[PDB]
Paper text:
Jasmonates are phytohormones that are pivotal in mediating plant responses to various biotic and abiotic stresses and regulating plant growth. The first crystal structure of OPR3 from tomato (SlOPR3) showed that the enzyme crystallized as a self-inhibitory dimer in which the L6 loop, a critical loop involved in substrate recognition and coenzyme binding, from each protomer intrudes into the active site cavity of the other protomer. Based on these observations, it was postulated that the formation of the self-inhibitory homodimer represents a mechanism for regulating OPR3 activity and, thereby, jasmonic acid biosynthesis.
Variant Y364P was produced to test whether residue Y364 is required for homodimerization, as proposed previously. Even variant Y364P, lacking the putative phosphorylation site, was crystallized as a self-inhibitory homodimer, indicating that Y364 is not required for dimerization. The slight difference between the dimers arises from the protomers being differently positioned to each other. The sulfate binding sites (R343, Y364/P364, and R366) are the same in both dimers, and despite Y364 being replaced by a proline in Y364P, one protomer in Y364P has a bound sulfate ion at the same position as the wild type, indicating that R343 and R366 are the main binders of the sulfate ion. In the other protomer of Y364P, no sulfate ion is bound. We previously demonstrated that this sulfate binding site is instead a coenzyme-phosphate binding site responsible for NADPH binding and the enzyme's preference for NADPH over NADH10. Thus, it seems unlikely that reverse phosphorylation of Y364 serves as a regulation mechanism in vivo.
Residue numbers in the entry:
A (entry chain A): 10 to 385
B (entry chain B): 11 to 384
The structure:
């Protein structure tokens, strides 16, 4: 089982290749990490295993979900430190994902009910919904387009949050530049309609993610920085006219950052689109995902360093990805929600608990969070 | 409530369990075989309603192997034998008229022509076609047909509908769903035409209106059912506003009924079951409530019998009829593996698991009619 051959991710000697994908769960009440998070990440930590936290706020304006943790205040840092200590006690490596939603927010999540910030004034269309604090679904409002100065302040929020994560004891951070959030709002030409030096060409559209990565690399070192992107996922109207070209341009910037810094990043993390097959249709189970596979392998071949694949991976797909050289590490999301001992279940090819979507984003510290059972 | 009677036109149905149309590829050389007889006989019940596999309307309408036709008198003769057996069991049977459009390959095109469609855009390579040798092939580039050719395809529907009535079928169902030929005109993600059949919502509904009106003018509205799927993720068949498109189709069908002076047999709607973007943060937010609203909005809008389909279970089918969401519920995969599915649902008995490996094989017995009874 190639998922359990050790892997050297920089200085980290990982004992297996099963990674906990970053997953918003909304148990960090009032943006403060709670004890439930410690019990949740401890359940899933393994000796030599790699974990990535839920997306974490970098500033008071970065949230678009209720009760997501932040790491921009010293109070949040003190509470994160307790969680890192229990994860490290089990011998696991853990990175904190730094998350800014950009236009994917609502006035209810913004200080003084202000507008969410973005690269554009275009809102997300009504084909997408936002989760409101009372559990209902809301409409994304019109965002405010930020200028160069404010862009450098958002970059500074990433750098201070990166420093705060290191103060908390995290082994590194991951930049959330995927899924149509703030960084992806500059990357995707279906969103970025700017005419200044941050819009238009591929080079200008990659300027914001280059500035973010370069700032955190200059603050804590390239070895402690992972980068997550999703060029071929159009979540929240985040489409690009040539996703492979965009992905390759991003990879080129990362290779250049590594060359100028003289050090490699921790990894490149890419989520792929994963069209579920329709067993109720005539030809739903006849299609192949080979074009999506070629795009992921192209990005992997283009990037000089560790590659983590994600999105709809099973035990079989994860084994196949590592065995064929398509990826070094495989991150699991939904199956890791419902299986605290997912690594052991994958090791043993054991049955997997089904995830209950109704409790993905509720606030209970136990129900649907830490009460998923272990193997008997 | 699934076994409370329902009057579908002149037909007094004894239960609400319907055999959904299902391609099985046992009609060797496009001629219905005796195996189809046993298959449908096994599943026919007194007062039950059956819908056949998709049936070719022309030599260019197929995109699967060993699929039956109704465009030849030979086909008509073999169909008659099947209908008689089903009728002997006391069941009503409709024949589904199927044109795959761009969803064809070429080992199925007589003159090795390009599949006809509303557009020249092909299906993307993430979908594959089943080849006669059992492998999977790539969909080729289709040919966009002009205004005159559209009237010939409508005539193929009319001639095939007459042939099905000659075979003894109680009616026909128009397959305008799942991204096939009719759906290729409906969906604005496929229809990029600039003539009177493309652009506005009304222009995209012109083709399905003409097809439905033609078969109604040939065999009567009471013997015509219509199947659509505005919110289906099959073969790149997306529409920017599935609710508007569904209501526009319903308005056309209601108007056809008003001018014809008779109601249609039924409206048959396939249900999305949205599982897309399950790996994203907010993709599944408000995806089950909008699908629920969509099915009910169309049901309230259509003046006549409503049939829902797709992934329905015993529990889900009971809830749909009890809550007024549908008059009839058609079952697919569970009816493959349970010949006495109606009897098993009546008794709440265990259900055999369907074997997907034998869904499209050619054997007349294995994986087709060898599923056991209760
Ligand atoms: C409930 C939920 C929350 C998620 N939150 C985040 C997140 O905060 N940041 C992020 O980059 N990805 C997030 N994801 C995407 C996952 O990290 C990962 O890409 C995906 O779950 C992998 O697909 P899988 O569930 O089939 O394993 C989330 C996914 C789910 C289902
Ligand atoms: C193997 C198979 C073949 C099918 N063939 C057709 C077909 O030829 N025409 C059609 O309109 N629907 C076809 N369908 C869709 C069914 O009519 C129906 O929508 C679906 O099977 C119901 O979902 P269920 O199987 O979970 O009950 C097919 C479905 C399956 C599984």
């Amino acid at each position: 089982n190639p998922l359990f051959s050790p892997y050297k991710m920089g200085k980290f000697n990982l004992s297996h290749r099963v990674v906990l994908a970053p997953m918003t769960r909304c148990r960090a009440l009032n943006n403060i990490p709670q004890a439930a998070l410690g019990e949740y990440y401890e359940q899933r930590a393994t000796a030599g295993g790699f974990l990535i936290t839920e997306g974490t706020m970098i500033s008071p304006t970065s949230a678009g979900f209720p009760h997501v943790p932040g790491i921009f205040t010293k109070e949040q840092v003190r509470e994160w430190k307790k969680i890192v200590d229990v994860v490290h006690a089990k011998g696991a490596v853990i990175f904190c994902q730094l998350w800014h939603v950009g236009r994917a927010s609502h006035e209810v999540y913004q200080p003084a009910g202000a507008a969410p910030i973005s690269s554009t004034e275009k809102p997300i269309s009504n084909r997408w919904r936002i989760l409101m604090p009372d559990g209902t679904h809301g409409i994304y409002p019109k965002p405010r387009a930020i200028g160069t100065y404010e862009i450098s302040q958002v970059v500074e929020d990433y750098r201070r949050s990166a420093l705060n994560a290191i103060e908390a004891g995290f082994d590194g951070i991951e930049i959330h530049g995927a899924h149509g959030y703030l960084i992806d709002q500059f990357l995707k030409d279906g969103i970025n309609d700017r005419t200044d030096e941050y819009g238009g060409s591929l080079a200008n559209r990659c300027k914001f993610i280059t500035q973010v990565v370069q700032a955190v690399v200059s603050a804590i070192g390239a070895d402690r920085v992972g980068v997550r992107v999703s060029p071929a996922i159009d979540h929240l109207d985040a489409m690009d006219s040539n996703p492979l070209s965009l992905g390759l341009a991003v990879v080129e910037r990362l290779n250049k950052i590594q060359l100028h810094s003289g050090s490699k990043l921790a990894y490149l993390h890419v989520t792929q689109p994963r069209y579920v097959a329709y067993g109720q249709t005539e030809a739903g189970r006849l299609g192949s995902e080979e074009e999506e596979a070629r795009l992921m392998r192209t990005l992997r071949n283009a990037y000089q360093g560790t590659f983590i694949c994600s999105g709809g991976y099973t035990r079989e797909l994860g084994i196949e990805a590592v065995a064929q050289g398509d990826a070094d590490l495989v991150s699991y999301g939904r199956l890791f929600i419902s299986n605290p001992d997912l690594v052991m279940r994958i090791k043993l090819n054991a049955p997997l608990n089904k995830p209950n979507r109704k409790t993905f984003y509720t606030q209970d510290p136990v129900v649907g969070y830490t009460d998923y059972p272990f193997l008997q």
